[PDB]
Amino acid sequence: TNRSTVKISNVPQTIVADELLRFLELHLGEDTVFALEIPTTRDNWKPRDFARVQFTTLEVKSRAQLLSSQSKLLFKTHNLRLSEAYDDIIPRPVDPRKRLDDIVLTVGFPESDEKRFCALEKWDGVRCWILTEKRR
């Protein structure tokens, strides 16, 4: 429950990422899959037997786990088994509230003894992400 990425146990070797994405979006909610990565032994022409899928919301992950536990996921006569992953595909917080976009960032130091602050360089339109799990 700490992360949102779910590792699929077995997938067909002949499928592509687009087909799996379409299947997941059909069974689950629309556009509820953020990242889908299929590891390849070779450079670009030999995918492995498993894949890792990142979901946008933990509710979608729980629903997918519930569906997998009931063996209701059947994609090309293969029963998809869902298991927890080790690391996230992309270090992105699950909570949309922590995601801050188009904000003003400035640096400085307490130059004066009173309640005064000095600005050296100011950046606009920066992205701020707060990762509670990674403590950064």
Binding site: N10, Q70, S71, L74, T77, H78, N79, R81
Partner: protein
């Protein structure tokens, strides 16, 4: 007449397929006795999904009070085979006409089984 009888719950399937048109090997772990089992089953004629609970029984003969070599009405997946390897937590190797079975449990649980004998396999999915 029944030697071994316990409730088994499946854990995973070797093919993990629904319409593979191939014999599927199941891995079921016993309740209480905690005995791991390997069994080849045909999903097309006898469907078995993950998480289902089924009972298992083994008897030397299907007749009542002897007559080796009427329990048919109770169970629904009767099989016939022989035990060829007993060496191991002792385990049994019974082949039902080429369908291998591996019942791995405890030495005390499996003690009344002889080598090179005919035994049946009674199953029911509740």
């Amino acid at each position: 007449i029944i030697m071994f009888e316990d409730i088994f719950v499946v854990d995973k399937l070797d093919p993990d397929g629904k319409k593979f048109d191939k014999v599927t090997r199941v891995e079921a772990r016993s309740h209480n006795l905690e005995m791991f089992m390997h069994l080849d089953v045909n999903t097309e004629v006898y469907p078995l999904a993950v998480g289902d609970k089924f009972t298992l029984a083994m008897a030397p003969t299907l007749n009542l009070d002897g007559t080796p070599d009427t329990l048919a009405d109770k169970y629904e997946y009767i099989m016939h085979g022989k035990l060829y390897k007993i060496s191991e937590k002792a385990e049994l190797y019974v082949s039902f006409g080429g369908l291998l079975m591996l019942l791995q449990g405890d030495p005390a649980h499996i003690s009344h089984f002889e080598l090179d004998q005919r035994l049946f396999l009674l199953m029911r999915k509740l």
